[PDB]
Every structure is written in structure tokens, then in C-alpha cells.
């Protein structure tokens, strides 16, 4: 029937309002935000050419670093930063093709579908070796905004990444299944994280990159040992706030 | 004593959707308080129900959120939307954006039309929903043969039209390679019943905003990933 969209809200009707019909609803709860985001989606990739028993040193090789920033939003080395930082845009890895892969790391499924302005959750991370050669790797998890501690080994022939009280994982051997998974709690000093844009600066002289919030991540993962590893994120107890537009899709 | 175990044939497999958790490596940590927050929502369906804009074609093939009507009654529909959450006309509505991440839908669809012409402009439209089987309606005579509502302009500016869920199956696909009887469900066409009528000093063309959203009993199910594309 008639209404007035200028009110900013109109009723949700079913066929019975204007016609001789009945409501036809069936129970369904797979649209719940928690359920939807509670599944693992590819969100990053990591590569290392250093052995386990050596000093970890930040490196990049064809757009792959040996450490990542834990955030569904695009991240990459920004203006020669030592470690990857959150990006404000996505770029093709290739300077010519104008087709993906992108040089930036992110959870494509999150970027392409995040109809909210802020989110809150714990993060379940899965790290998988891209081939079947027996794994021998050490990973260090650094909480949001904590010291990276990219120091020298304090003892000969030991993985510098394991030289910490920070949570770290060590998998190696013929009995392992070439992967690692674990869940970390939300560690940002922010109450909720911005899911798309942050309309401001991060420091007091407003000289940072406008659009990026301060400490808006889940920490970092540093890796040593040989191999290329893919990473997945799974959002536990996910909560979202303030509905907002989704990424635009080209007209068919 | 140790427990005997039978290692299943899928040892070491990483299931991206297993309904189970993994090992907590930094527990006993407080999640930074956010009790002051507002605007939280828990169901993606909430989004589907917010009316957002349909993309209509310009005379220059440019996309606009409305269609034109004037002092005449064309023998053809002013606009035609195929009922599919795949329709290109609704490709950028929140409804379609959410539906792209689910396999099936069920329930009502709400097509909202907002008359933006002058207050001195009057007229009547016939909004029709034609179920499939006999093709698209070619005339007003045919369009009236199906589900329809007559929209009369006046004090109230908009008309909330519902495309009833009429289907051979309980659920319908949100997308498809080729149209099937389970993924394409007919057409919504709006006709000019009486011409837009008005006094002198009033522009001949009136613009009617067009929006879509899920109705009261609308639901989606089966989380999936849509065909990827390069933004541009």
C-alpha cells in the first residue's frame, strides 16, 4: 500500500498486506552475523627462506614477506616500513596485466562483504604449508601494538623468534601434518575495530596516513623456517555495529 | 592406562567449516570493554530489509536510481525487472549484496517507488508481477492478468509493492549460470495507467525513485562466496 519513504523507514510487508495471501516464513538462522563469519577464509600468505635455527630478519620476495599483520583489511609494506602495515587501498601485483593477484594481503571475502562500520571478535588463525615437504618452522605471535623485538639470537643456532615469552608455535617432523592453528583473543586497545574506513589520523600532529586507525589489528605473525605458508582467519564471537554500504559491483 | 584409538582416514585435514574450536594461545585476556557502543545488529537479514536503490538505465545508458514518466500512457512498461536476486538492475542494492553471499532465498520482496514529481502532478501507475510460464507480459491487458496494484499519486509519496513468493520449490537460487525454474521467477513491470497530469509551469518529466529489499517473511540461507571480480 501507500507509504512515505521520506520518514526514513517504511514497513516490511508480505503478500497479505495488498493481496489475498499468507505469510510464508520458515525458521532459518544461517544469516546470523556470528554464524556467517564463523568459518575460515583465506586471508594472507607468508614466505621464508631462512632456516629455523637462525636470526629472523624481515624480507620481501615478489610481494611476500616473512611476517604478516593480522587484520582482514589490506596490509602490505607501506612506504618502506620495516614490517607490513595496514594499507588504504589494493594494488595489482603486476605493473602491466591489471588483473589479480594483488600485492596487498587481505581477507577478500571480508573486504567484499563488510556491511558494517565497526566489528569485534576473537581471531582463529590457520597457517598451512603450500607443499608436502616435511615442515620445520617456528612462528611468533605478537599482540596488537606490542614490541616486534627483531633482535639477534642470544644463543647460537636457536630460532630467534622462539626467544620470547610471546605466544609462539614450533612444528616439525615426519609425524606432523604441515599446518598450525590456534585462536587469539581481541588485543587492540580500541573497543571496536573500524571495518572499512577510519575518518581520521593516528597521532597528535596529524601527520599519519589519513584513513587508518591507530592499533587496529590483532597483532602480528613472524615466521622462520623454509617454505611458503597460506593463512586463514575465522572470526569467533563476531559482533558488528552500524550498517554501511558494501563494495560496489560493476553493472552487468 | 593409555586409551586405544582408531585414527580415522582423514587425519591432519583442515576443515574450514568444522563446527569446533582450536587451541587458545593467549587466554585469560579481557576483550577491551565496548558497553558504550550503539548500532549493533546480529542478523544479516536486517540489512536485506533496508530498501536500497535499483539501477535504471539513462537515455545515454548511464545508471540512475529512478525512471521517467510524463503526460502519456505508453503501450509498453516504463520499467521491467526480472525477479532474481541476480537481476542486474538490483546488482548494487544491499539486498543483492547480501544475497550474493547465500545460496538460496524464500519469502517476499518489497519494491518501493517514491514519486518525486511536483505536488501539482497527478497520475496512476499499475505495478504488476507476472509469474513465469507464459513469458513476459506484452501488453497492459496481459500485465493485469497477474498480480498487480494500482498506485495513485497524492499526499502520500511512495508505494510499497510486494512481489509474493510464488514458487514450485520452497527455496529459490540467488544466482545461476543459465536461468532455470528455480532461479528466475517472473517479472515486475510498472505501467502508466493514466498519464501523469499537471498544470502549466510544471516540468513534463517526473522522476520516480526505485528501491528493493526483502519483505517481512524474507530469508536467506547457506553462506557461500560469490564469483569474484576486479573492482572498477
Amino acid at each position: 500500500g501507500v507509504d512515505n519513504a521520506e520518514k526514513g523507514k517504511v514497513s516490511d510487508d508480505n503478500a497479505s498486506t495488498d493481496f489475498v495471501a499468507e505469510p510464508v516464513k520458515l525458521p532459518e538462522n544461517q544469516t546470523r552475523v556470528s554464524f556467517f563469519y564463523d568459518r575460515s577464509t583465506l586471508s594472507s600468505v607468508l614466505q621464508s627462506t631462512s632456516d629455523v635455527s637462525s636470526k629472523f630478519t624481515p624480507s620481501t620476495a615478489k610481494n611476500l614477506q616473512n611476517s604478516i599483520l593480522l587484520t582482514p583489511l589490506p596490509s602490505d609494506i607501506v612506504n618502506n616500513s620495516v614490517l607490513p602495515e595496514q594499507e588504504r587501498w589494493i594494488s595489482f601485483a603486476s605493473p602491466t596485466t591489471q588483473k589479480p593477484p594483488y600485492k596487498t594481503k587481505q581477507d577478500w571475502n571480508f573486504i567484499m562483504f563488510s556491511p558494517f562500520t565497526y566489528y569485534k571478535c576473537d581471531l582463529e588463525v590457520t597457517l598451512s604449508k603450500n607443499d608436502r615437504e616435511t615442515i620445520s618452522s617456528v612462528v611468533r605471535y605478537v599482540p596488537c601494538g606490542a614490541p616486534s623485538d627483531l633482535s639477534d639470537q642470544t644463543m647460537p643456532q636457536t630460532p630467534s623468534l622462539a626467544d620470547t615469552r610471546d605466544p609462539h608455535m614450533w612444528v616439525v617432523g615426519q609425524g606432523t601434518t604441515n599446518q598450525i592453528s590456534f585462536v587469539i583473543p581481541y588485543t587492540s586497545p580500541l573497543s571496536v575495530l573500524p571495518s572499512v574506513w577510519f575518518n581520521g589520523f593516528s597521532n597528535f600532529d596529524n601527520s599519519s596516513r589519513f584513513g587508518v586507525a591507530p592499533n587496529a589489528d590483532f597483532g602480528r605473525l613472524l615466521l622462520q623456517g623454509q617454505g611458503t605458508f597460506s593463512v586463514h582467519y575465522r572470526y569467533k564471537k563476531m559482533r558488528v555495529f552500524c550498517p554501511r554500504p558494501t563494495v560496489f559491483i560493476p553493472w552487468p | 592406562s593409555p586409551f586405544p584409538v582408531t585414527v580415522r582416514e582423514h587425519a591432519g585435514t583442515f576443515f574450514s567449516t568444522t563446527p569446533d574450536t582450536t587451541v587458545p594461545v593467549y587466554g585469560n585476556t579481557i576483550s577491551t570493554p565496548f558497553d558504550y557502543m550503539c548500532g549493533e545488529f546480529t542478523d544479516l537479514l536486517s540489512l536485506c530489509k533496508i530498501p536500497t536503490f535499483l539501477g535504471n538505465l539513462d537515455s545515454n545508458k548511464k545508471r540512475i536510481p529512478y525512471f521517467s514518466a510524463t503526460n502519456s500512457t505508453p503501450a509498453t512498461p516504463l520499467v521491467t525487472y526480472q525477479v532474481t536476486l541476480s537481476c542486474s538492475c538490483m546488482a548494487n542494492s544491499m539486498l543483492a549484496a547480501v544475497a550474493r553471499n547465500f545460496n538460496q532465498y524464500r519469502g517476499s520482496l518489497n519494491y518501493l517507488f517514491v514519486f518525486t514529481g511536483s505536488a501539482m502532478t497527478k497520475g496512476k501507475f499499475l505495478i504488476s508481477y507476472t509469474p513465469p510460464g507464459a513469458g513476459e507480459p506484452k501488453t497492459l491487458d496481459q500485465a493485469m492478468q497477474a498480480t498487480y496494484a494500482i498506485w495513485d499519486l497524492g499526499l502520500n509519496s511512495s508505494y510499497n509493492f510486494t512481489v509474493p513468493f510464488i514458487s514450485p520449490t520452497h527455496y529459490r537460487q540467488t544466482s545461476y549460470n543459465t536461468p532455470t525454474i528455480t532461479s528466475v521467477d517472473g517479472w515486475l513491470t510498472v505501467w502508466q495507467l493514466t498519464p501523469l497530469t499537471y498544470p502549466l509551469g510544471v516540468p513534463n518529466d517526473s522522476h520516480i525513485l526505485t528501491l528493493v529489499s526483502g519483505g517481512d517473511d524474507f530469508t536467506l540461507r547457506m553462506p557461500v562466496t560469490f564469483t569474484k571480480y576486479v573492482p572498477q
Binding site: 520458515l26 525458521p27 | 563446527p19 569446533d20 520452497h170
Partner: peptide, 24 residues
Amino acid sequence: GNEGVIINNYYSNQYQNSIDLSAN
């Protein structure tokens, strides 16, 4: 048929099996 484990299924019934529902 063909299920003969005495301890209950580890995954809840909603998840282990599709949910049967009547539309009427």
C-alpha cells in the same frame, strides 16, 4: 540405518544432520 555407536554424536544434531522441517 547403520549407525551403531553408543556414545552420543560429538557434533550436535543440527550440525551433524540437515534439519527436517515441515512447511505446514
